[PDB]
Amino acid sequence: HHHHSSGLVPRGSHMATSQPSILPKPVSYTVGSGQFVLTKNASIFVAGNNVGETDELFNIGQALAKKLNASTGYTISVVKSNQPTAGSIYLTTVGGNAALGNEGYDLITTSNQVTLTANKPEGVFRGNQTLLQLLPAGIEKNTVVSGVQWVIPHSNISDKPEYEYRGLMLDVARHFFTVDEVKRQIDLASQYKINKFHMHLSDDQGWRIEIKSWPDLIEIGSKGQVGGGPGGYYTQEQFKDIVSYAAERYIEVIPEIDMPGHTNAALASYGELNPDGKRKAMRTDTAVGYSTLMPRAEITYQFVEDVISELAAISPSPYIHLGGDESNATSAADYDYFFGRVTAIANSYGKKVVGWDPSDTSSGATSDSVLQNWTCSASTGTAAKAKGMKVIVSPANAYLDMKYYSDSPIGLQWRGFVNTNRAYNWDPTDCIKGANIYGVESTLWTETFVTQDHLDYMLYPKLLSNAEVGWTARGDRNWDDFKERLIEHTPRLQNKGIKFFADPIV
Ligand SMILES: CC(=O)N[C@@H]1[C@@H](O)[C@@H](O)[C@@H](CO)O[C@H]1O
Numbered sequence: 001h002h003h004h005s006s007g008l009v010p011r012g013s014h015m016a017t018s019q020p021s022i023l024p025k026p027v028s029y030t031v032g033s034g035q036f037v038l039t040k041n042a043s044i045f046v047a048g049n050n051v052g053e054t055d056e057l058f059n060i061g062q063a064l065a066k067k068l069n070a071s072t073g074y075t076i077s078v079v080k081s082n083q084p085t086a087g088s089i090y091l092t093t094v095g096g097n098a099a100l101g102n103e104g105y106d107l108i109t110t111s112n113q114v115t116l117t118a119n120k121p122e123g124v125f126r127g128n129q130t131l132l133q134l135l136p137a138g139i140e141k142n143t144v145v146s147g148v149q150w151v152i153p154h155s156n157i158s159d160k161p162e163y164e165y166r167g168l169m170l171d172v173a174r175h176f177f178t179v180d181e182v183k184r185q186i187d188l189a190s191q192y193k194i195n196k197f198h199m200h201l202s203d204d205q206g207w208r209i210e211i212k213s214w215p216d217l218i219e220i221g222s223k224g225q226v227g228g229g230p231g232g233y234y235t236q237e238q239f240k241d242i243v244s245y246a247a248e249r250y251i252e253v254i255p256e257i258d259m260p261g262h263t264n265a266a267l268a269s270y271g272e273l274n275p276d277g278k279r280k281a282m283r284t285d286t287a288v289g290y291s292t293l294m295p296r297a298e299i300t301y302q303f304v305e306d307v308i309s310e311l312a313a314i315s316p317s318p319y320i321h322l323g324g325d326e327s328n329a330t331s332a333a334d335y336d337y338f339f340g341r342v343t344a345i346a347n348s349y350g351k352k353v354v355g356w357d358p359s360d361t362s363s364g365a366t367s368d369s370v371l372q373n374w375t376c377s378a379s380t381g382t383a384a385k386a387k388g389m390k391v392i393v394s395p396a397n398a399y400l401d402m403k404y405y406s407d408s409p410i411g412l413q414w415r416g417f418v419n420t421n422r423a424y425n426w427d428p429t430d431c432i433k434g435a436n437i438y439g440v441e442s443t444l445w446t447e448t449f450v451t452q453d454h455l456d457y458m459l460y461p462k463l464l465s466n467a468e469v470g471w472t473a474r475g476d477r478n479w480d481d482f483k484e485r486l487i488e489h490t491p492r493l494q495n496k497g498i499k500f501f502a503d504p505i506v
Pocket residue numbers: 288325326356374399401412445447
C-alpha cells in the first residue's frame with residue numbers, strides 16, 4: 001500500500017439534497033431517506049425526568065430558539081411537554097443512554113421531528129451544537145437569511161467526548177480584551193464543544209482582576225499592556241458576568257493568577273512585594289522569566305491569600321490556576337516551597353490547584369492538584385504521574401499563538417509554526433505516557449494579538465483542529481477527512497462573522 005502526507009493546495013486555499021457540517025466528528029452519523037423541514041410554526045419541546053430538570057432544559061431550549069430565530073427570522077418558542085407536535089424539535093433526558101456519559105447524546109431526525117436524547121442537560125447542550133451543524137449553512141448567520149429552505153436530512157447520530165477536559169485559554173494580560181470580546185470567544189468555542197475556558201488574568205505587563213483588599217493592582221497594575229496601550233481590567237461583577245455567560249454554555253471558567261513568576265504587574269503596584277520596598281517600573285516588552293514574588297517573606301503569602309480569598313468568592317469552579325511557569329528568578333528550593341505554600345492556601349479556600357509544569361514537582365502538591373503540561377518532554381509530569389495527578393496537555397500543536405507559517409503577519413514561533421494540519425495531527429498520548437490525561441487545552445497567548453480580528457485569525461481554523469483532538473477518538477481521526485470537512489464548513493465560519501485565516505494547507 002501507498003501513503004503520503006499533505007502539501008499546500010495547488011492554486012491556493014479552498015477556504016479562500018443537503019450538506020451538514022459536523023465538527024468535531026461524532027461517534028456515528030448515518031443518513032436515511034427524507035428530510036425534516038424547519039418552518040415558522042416550529043416549537044421546541046423539552047422534557048426531563050423531573051420538574052427541576054425540565055426547567056433546566058427549558059433554558060437550553062430558549063438558547064437554541066434564540067440562535068434559530070436570528071437566522072430564520074422565525075419566533076420559535078419553547079414548551080414544557082413530552083408530547084411534541086409534527087415539525088417540532090424535542091429535547092429530552094428521559095431514557096438517556098448511560099454509556100454516553102454526561103456530555104453524550106443521541107440525535108435522531110425524522111421527517112416529522114428532531115429528537116435529541118441525552119443523560120443530562122449538559123449533553124442536550126452539546127447535542128444542540130451538532131443540531132445547528134445539520135441545518136444548512138446560513139443558520140449560523142446573526143441576521144435573517146432568505147431563500148434557504150431550512151432542512152435537515154433524515155439522520156441518526158450518537159456521540160460522546162473522548163476527553164473530559166477540552167479547553168481554551170485566553171491571555172488577557174499581554175493585551176486586554178473587553179467583556180464583550182471574551183464572551184464572543186467563549187460563545188464561538190462552545191459551538192465546537194469546547195467545555196473549559198482558562199483566563200490568564202495576570203502577567204508581567206498587566207493585572208486584569210479587581211482585588212478589593214489591594215486596589216492598586218488595578219489603579220496601577222491594569223493601566224498598561226504589551227506595546228503601551230491603555231490596558232484595562234474586569235471588575236468582580238464583570239468577572240461574575242463572564243462566569244455566568246460561560247455557565248449557560250456548560251463551560252467551566254478557571255481563573256489563573258500566575259505565581260511566583262510572571263508577576264511584574266503586581267510588583268509594579270505594591271513596593272512592599274519587592275525586597276527593596278520600591279515599586280517596579282511597568283513593563284510593556286515581551287520578555288519572560290525575570291520576575292518573582294519574594295518566596296520567603298510573609299507579606300507574599302498574605303498577598304496571595306487575599307487574592308485567592310477574593311477570587312474564590314467569585315469563581316465557582318473547584319479549580320484555581322496558580323501558574324508556576326518560567327520562574328527563572330526563583331531558586332528550585334524556593335519554588336518548591338512557594339508552590340506548596342500557595343497550594344495549601346488555595347486548598348483552605350476550597351479550591352484545587354492547576355499549575356504549569358514544573359509545578360507538579362512541588363512537595364506541597366496533592367493528588368487533587370492538576371498539571372498543565374506545556375513542555376511535553378520525556379521527563380515532564382514524572383512527579384504528577386507518581387502522585388496520581390490529572391494532566392492537561394498543551395503541546396506545540398495546541399499553542400495557537402504560533403504563526404501558521406514563516407510569513408504569518410502575527411504570532412510567535414518559539415515552538416515552530418503551527419498550521420491547521422499540525423493543530424490536527426497529534427494525540428494527547430503523544431505528549432505524555434503513563435498518565436491520567438484529563439484532556440487538552442488550546443492556549444492563545446497574546447504578545448502579538450491586539451484586536452478581535454487577530455484572535456479570530458489565529459483561533460480559526462486552528463482551534464477546530466484542537467477541538468476535534470479533544471472530542472473525537474483517535475481511531476476516527478484522519479487529516480484527509482477533516483481537511484475536506486473543513487472546506488465544507490468554511491461558509492459557516494464566514495456566516496458567524498469569524499475573520500479566520502484561509503489556510504493554504506486546507
Ligand atoms: C506556560 C507558557 O506558555 N508560558 C509563556 C507564556 O507566558 C507566553 O510567553 C507563551 C508564548 O507562546 O509561551 C511562554 O513563554
